[PDB]
Amino acid sequence: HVSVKPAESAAGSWETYTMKVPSEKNLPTTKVVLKMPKDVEFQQYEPIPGWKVSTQKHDDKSVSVTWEATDGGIQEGQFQQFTFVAKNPDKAEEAAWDAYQYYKDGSIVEWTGDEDADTPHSITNITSA
Ligand SMILES: [Cu+2]
Number of domains in the chain: 1
Query: What technique determined this structure?
Result: X-ray
Question: Resolution of the coordinates in A?
Answer: 2.1
Q: Residue 42: which domain range? A: 1-129
Rounded CA-CA distance 64/116 in Å is: 24
24 CA distance to ligand 1 middle (Å): 7
The three state secondary structure string of 67-96 is EEECCCCECCCCEEEEEEEEECCCCCEEEE
Rounded CA-CA distance 125/105 in Å is: 34
Q: Going edge to edge, which strands form the sheet with 63-69? A: 51-57, 63-69, 29-35, 99-103, 108-111
Task: Consult the annotation and say whether 24 binds a ligand.
Answer: yes
Task: Consult the annotation and say whether 58 binds a ligand.
Answer: no
33 CA distance to ligand 1 middle (Å): 16
